[PDB]
Amino acid sequence: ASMTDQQAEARAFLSEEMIAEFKAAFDMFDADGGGDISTKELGTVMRMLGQNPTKEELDAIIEEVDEDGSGTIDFEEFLVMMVRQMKEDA
Template sequence: DKDGDGQITTKELGTVMRSLGQNPSESELQDMINEVDADNNGTIDFPEFLTMMARKMKDTDSEEEIREAFKVFDRDNNGFISAAELRHVMTSIGEKLTDEEVDEMIREADQDGDGRM
């Protein structure tokens, strides 16, 4: 949700997919959105995003895809994503996040309070 409007467009979804090593066509992106777009507004809001991710998690090869996505963030391959690594990847895909926003993302996902995921 690059522009912070609470919706994910096909363009925003494409940016994320490409950052994870995928190269979906415009029609594939639209199909992904249409699968979960409950209100038929052409974009994905957060509940619809959760639905999409839950379906993706059920795919047989999704664990490997998740590992590959994690490796994109875990630049030093230590098994954790630090705030600096998260900031680097988010910046490289065009996200302009403040330190506070990155720290908040880490806090939300940091289960043991060590400052990393």
């Protein structure tokens, strides 16, 4: 597919409640609730260890989902990311 229908199959398993629950934990990626993961804040959640991060280190995760080009993702498209390899079976 492309990306739209992508969140569709991933939403079927994420009942309207399964998403409203992650919304709260969605503030962990951003700062206090910027409502975005863009390499701006993303490079930190992963580089929070304290290491100079590479420009391609935070962009390598952006091309895995952020295909539009903006170079950022929200809690919406971020869900399908974990709904890919489900231990259930996949």
